[PDB]
Symmetry: C3
Subunit: 430 residues, 3 copies
C-alpha cells in the first residue's frame, strides 16, 4: 500500500495568451566558442552540477532503507551481580560472548512510509537536474550579454577615438587663428571643452570595455580565458534576429525553472504519504544468528549454535497530537510547493512578456536611433560649413558637434540593448 | 521550575525622536484611490509570495504542536514476539533450549518528567518561533501593499509620460511639415529642415521608450496581483493625482518598536533563544525517563488471552551526568551566543527601520520642494518655447533658440512627471517604513 | 588514525599577474582623522559585524560538542524495574512479581575511534569555526570600506550642495538685473523666462543635493550603529583627500594567502576532506562499550548494604557485511560535497580576481577622466566669463550665455561626481584586495 495522494498538476494561474538550440541560436563562431569554454569551466555551474551528485547520493541513502541489511558483530557481556538478585543466592560473576551475523531493525513496508520517503528523495534529485539545466540556460545568456556589452563598449571607444582626432585637429585650426588674431577667445574655449569631453568619454568607454572583459574572463573560468576572447571582435550580428514565443502552456512544460518546481511539489506530495503511514501501525524485524558461549574458550566449539529472532508490531493510539501535527506540517509544506509552482509559472510569464515588450520596442527604436544619427551627422556637416563660411556664430556648430556625438553613442547603446533583450528572450523561454 | 532567564526587552539603540520635519490609520484609510484598493485587495488574496509566507505560519504552528506533544505522556498498542535458541552453558536447563515469548497489549514510550522545565522551555521556544512567523506574515502583507502602490504609480507615471510624448510627437511632425513646405518652396534653409527632422526622429524613439516602460510596469503589476483575472483589473486611464493621504504623523521610534512587524518578529526570535537557554540549563540537571507495558503474554501463542495471564512492566530511570566532554557546557555556550546574536538582530532591525523611516522622511520633504521647483521650471520653458516660435515666425532669431526651447520644454515636462511620481512613491515608502 | 586523504591546496585557477598592501592596514590607508574615528565607532557598535562575531562563538561551541563525543563520559543513575509475569513465562513457574534496583556510576556508549571517524568529524567542526573567523575578518574589512564609501558619498553631496548654492545665488543676482531690464523694456520677455529657468534648475538641484546628503548621512548613522553616532559625523567637508591614492596590488598568488574570502573557503574545503575520512571510517567496524558500577538489590531497602556491590561491562564490535548501499552513498555524498567546496574555493579566487581587476581599471581610468573633467570644467567657466561679456555688450543673443551657464554648472557637478567616484573606486580596490596580511584579530577573544 501507499498513502501518498495522486499528483495532479495545478491549473496554470496565468492567462492563456500573450499580447530552439543554443548553438543553433548563437550564430557567431567565436561567441559559441566562448560559451563552450564557460559551460565547461564556470565554477558556479560546476557547483550546481555537483549539487545533483549530492541529490543522487541522498536518494541512494534513502533507497538503502527499503532493503534489509546484514552485520557481523561480536558482543561480550561480563558483570558481577548480587546474591539477592540471582537464583544461586550467592554473588556471582557471569560472562556471555556472542559472534556472527545480525539483522539491524528492518521496517516491513505495509503502508509505504519508506517507499514514500524514497520517492521524495527521487523527486528532489530530479528537481536538482532541472535546476542544473536552468543554470546552464542562465550561463549561456550571461556569457552572451557580457560579450554584447564588451562589443558595445569597443564600438563606443572606436567612435570616441575618431571623434577625438577630429576635435584635436579642429582645435589646432582654431588655436592658430587666435595666434593670428582672427579667432574669438570664446570660440577657442568652446573648442577646448569639446576636446576634453571626448577625452573624458574615452576614459569612461575604456572602463566599460575592460570591466566587460574582466566579467567575461570570470564567466569563462579558464586560466587562459583572457587569451580566448578576441581583441578585435566580429561586427556581424551574433544571434537569430527573430524567435517565435509559442503558447504559455508549452513554456510550462519547457522551462527548467518550472520543472524544478513541480518536482519539488511531487517530493512534498510523497512526504504527505509518509505522514499518513505514521498513523498506521509500524512492523519491524530484528534478528541475530551465530554462536554463544560462557567463556572465551567455548565459542570455537561444537554445538555452540545460537540465534535470536524478534518481530514486533506497534500502533500509536495516544500521542500528544504529534502525528496530526506531522500531517499538518507536511500539508503546509505541500501547499507552499503548490504556491511556489504557481508563482514560478507567473514569474516566467512576466519575464517573457517583458522580453517581448522590449524586443518589439527596441526593433522600432533602433530605426529611430540610426535615422537620428544620420540626421545629426548631416546637420553637423551643414552647420560646419555655415560657421566655416562665417554666416553663423560658433554656437550652432558647437551644439551640432555635441548632438552628433550623443546621438551616435546613443545608437550604439540602443543597438546593444536590442541584442541583449533578444538573448533575455531566449533565456526567459528556455 | 523553568530555568530560562527572565526576559527583559533590549533597550532601543536609536534616537529618542526623528530629525527634521496620525499613524493609527488603516491602509484603506491611507489609500483614497478606490481602484488602487481593489488592486491591492486582489494582490492580498492572490499573490504567491504572500501565500508562501502565510503557509510557513502553518508550518511553524505544527512545529510548536510537535514540541507541545513531547510534554504529555503517550500510549501505543503493541504486539511483540521473541524467539531464541539459548545454548546449554547459558541456559537454565543444561541442554540447548529454544524459548519463545509472544506478548500483546498497551505500552508507554519513554516519557520525560519535566521537573526542571526542559521540555517546557523547548515548547516555549517553538511557540515563540510561531509568533515570529505570524509577525513575519504581517510584514510580508505590508511589503506587498507598498509594492502594489509603487508598481501602480510607476505604471501611472509611464502612461502619463507616454501621453505627453505622443502629443509632443504630433506637434513635432506638424511643425516639420511646415518647415518641409517652406524648404520645398526654397525659403527655409537645409538645416532648419534637418534640425526639425532629427528632433522628430528623437521624439519617435522617446515614445517607444515610454511604451516599453508602461508595458514592463503593466507586467510587473500583473504578477503582484497574481490572479488569472488581473489584466482586466488594471485601469488604462490615469486616476486623479491624490491617490493617497499626503500628510502622516510618524510619532516617536518608541511607538515604532511596538507597531512595526519586522521588529516584533525579531523580538519573538529573541524570546525563543531565552527559552533555549532554559533547555540547555535544565540539561545539566537530572532526566527522569518512564517506560511501561500492560497486557497479556505467554510462552505459546494460543494462550495469549488466558486467565491469570496479565503481564506488565514499570521502569523509571533517572540519569545525571558528572562528566561528559564539556558538551553540556559547550551547549550552554552555544545557546548564550545565539541569544546574543538574537539581541544584535533585534537591535539591528530597529536601527535598519530607523534608516528607512529617516530616508522616507527626508525624501518626502525634499521632493515636495523639488516638485514645486520643477513645475515652475517647466512652465518657464513652455512659455520660453512660445516666445521662440514668435521669434522664428517674425524671422528675427535663428532655429537654434527654437530648437533648445522645445528640447528643454520637453525634458522639463518629463522630469516633472518623474518628480511627481517619485514623491508619492516616497509616501508609500514612508508607509512601508513605519509599518 | 584518521583515514581522510592528505589535504593539498588546489592550484590557482587564474594567471600569475594582472596586466598593468601587506604593510597597508586600514588605519594607515585612511588618512583622515575624522574618518578613522567613524570606522573605529562602527567596528565597536555595528550589529551585523556583532552577529558575524557571535557566529564564531557558536561555531567554537559546536567544535567543543564534537570534541566531547571523542572522550568517555561518566554519569550517576538510578534504574528501577517492577514487572509481573505469569507462570508459563517465569522460570520459577508461578505468578511472579519481581523487582530490581540499581544506583551508581554509569559509563554510556563510548566509541573507541581506532579507524578515526569521530576525530574527522571533530576536524570538520574545527575548520568550520576557522572559516567562521575568516568570514568575520571579511565582514569587518567590508564594514571599514562601506563606512568609508558612505562618508565619501556624504562628502561629495556637501560639495554639490555648496556649488549648487553658489551657482544659485549668481542666478538670483543675474535674474534681478534682467527683471529690471524687462521692466525697463531693455531685455526681451524670452530672456526673462530663460533666466527664470536657470534659477529654478539650481533650486530643484539644491533639493536633490539635500536628499542625497541626508540619505548618505542616515546610512552612516546605521553603519556606525550607535545612539551617539549622529553627533560624531562631521557637519563640514574634510579639507584634503582622505585616503592613499596609489595602492600596489601585488600578485594573485599573494591575494590567495591574504584575502579572507579565499581562506574561509579553504577551511571549508579542508572540513569536507575530513567528512570523507568519516565516511571511509564507516566501512570499518564500530567498537562501542558500555559499563556500570554501584549497588543493586531486589528490594528498595536493600540498595546500600554489604554484598550489594555490582558492576557491568559490555563491549560490542559491529561490522556491516551488507548495508543497503548506504555507506557507499554517504561516501559518494562526502566526495560530492568536497568537490563543491573545491569549486567554491576556485570560484572565490576567480571572483576576487574580477573585483580587483575591475577596481584597478576603475582607478586608472578615473584618474585620467578626473583630469579631463577638471580641464573641461574650468574651460566652460572661462568660456562662461567670455560669453557673459559678449552678451552684456549686446553683441550676441542670450542663448550663448544661457548655454554656457548650463554647461558650466553641469560640468562642475560632473567633476564632483567623477572625483568622489575615483575615491569610492580606491575604497572598492582596498576591499577587493582584502586588507594587509592579517588585518583583524578582533575575532579571537575566546
Amino acid at each position: 500500500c501507499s498513502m501518498a495522494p495522486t499528483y495532479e498538476r495545478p491549473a496554470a494561474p496565468v492567462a492563456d495568451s500573450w499580447s530552439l538550440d543554443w548553438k543553433s541560436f548563437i550564430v557567431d563562431a567565436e561567441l559559441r566558442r566562448l560559451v563552450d569554454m564557460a559551460l565547461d569551466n564556470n565554477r558556479s555551474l560546476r557547483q550546481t552540477l555537483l549539487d545533483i551528485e549530492a541529490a543522487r547520493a541522498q536518494y541512494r541513502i534513502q533507497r538503502a532503507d527499503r532493503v534489509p541489511g546484514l552485520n557481523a558483530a561480536a558482543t561480550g557481556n561480563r558483570q558481577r551481580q548480587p546474591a539477592d538478585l540471582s537464583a544461586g543466592n550467592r554473588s556471582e560473576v557471569a560472562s556471555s560472548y556472542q559472534v556472527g551475523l545480525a539483522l539491524p531493525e528492518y521496517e516491513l513496508d505495509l503502508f509505504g512510509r519508506v517507499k514514500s520517503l524514497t520517492d521524495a528523495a527521487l523527486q528532489q534529485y530530479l528537481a536538482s537536474e532541472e535546476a542544473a539545466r536552468a543554470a546552464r540556460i542562465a550561463l549561456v545568456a550571461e556569457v552572451s550579454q557580457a560579450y554584447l556589452s564588451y562589443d558595445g563598449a569597443l564600438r563606443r571607444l572606436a567612435l570616441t577615438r575618431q571623434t577625438l582626432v577630429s576635435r584635436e585637429y579642429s582645435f589646432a585650426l582654431i588655436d592658430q587663428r587666435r595666434a593670428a588674431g582672427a579667432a574669438t577667445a570664446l570660440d577657442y574655449q568652446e573648442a577646448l571643452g569639446l576636446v576634453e569631453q571626448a577625452r573624458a568619454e574615452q576614459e569612461r568607454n575604456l572602463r566599460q570595455k575592460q570591466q566587460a572583459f574582466n566579467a567575461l574572463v570570470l564567466l569563462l573560468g579558464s586560466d587562459d580565458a583572457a587569451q580566448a576572447i578576441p581583441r578585435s571582435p566580429g561586427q556581424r550580428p551574433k544571434l537569430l534576429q527573430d524567435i517565435a514565443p509559442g503558447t504559455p502552456s508549452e513554456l510550462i512544460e519547457r522551462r527548467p525553472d518550472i520543472l524544478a518546481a513541480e518536482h519539488r511539489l511531487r517530493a512534498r506530495n510523497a512526504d504527505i504519504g509518509a505522514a499518513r503511514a505514521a498513523f498506521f501501525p509500524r512492523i519491524s524485524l530484528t534478528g541475530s544468528f551465530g554462536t554463544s558461549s560462557a567463556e572465551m574458550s567455548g565459542l570455537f566449539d561444537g554445538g555452540s549454535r545460537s540465534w535470536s529472532f524478534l518481530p514486533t508490531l506497534t500502533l500509536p493510539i495516544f500521542d500528544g497530537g504529534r502525528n496530526r501535527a506531522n500531517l499538518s506540517l507536511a500539508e503546509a509544506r505541500k501547499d507552499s510547493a503548490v504556491a511556489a509552482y504557481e508563482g514560478t509559472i507567473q514569474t516566467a510569464f512576466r519575464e517573457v512578456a517583458d522580453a517581448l515588450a522590449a524586443s518589439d520596442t527596441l526593433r522600432r527604436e533602433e530605426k529611430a536611433l540610426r535615422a537620428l544619427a544620420n540626421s545629426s551627422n548631416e546637420a553637423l556637416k551643414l552647420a560646419k560649413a555655415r560657421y566655416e563660411s562665417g554666416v553663423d556664430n560658433h554656437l550652432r556648430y558647437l551644439d551640432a558637434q555635441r548632438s552628433s556625438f550623443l546621438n551616435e553613442i546613443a545608437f550604439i547603446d540602443g543597438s546593444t540593448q536590442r541584442q541583449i533583450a533578444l538573448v533575455d528572450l531566449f533565456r526567459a523561454l528556455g
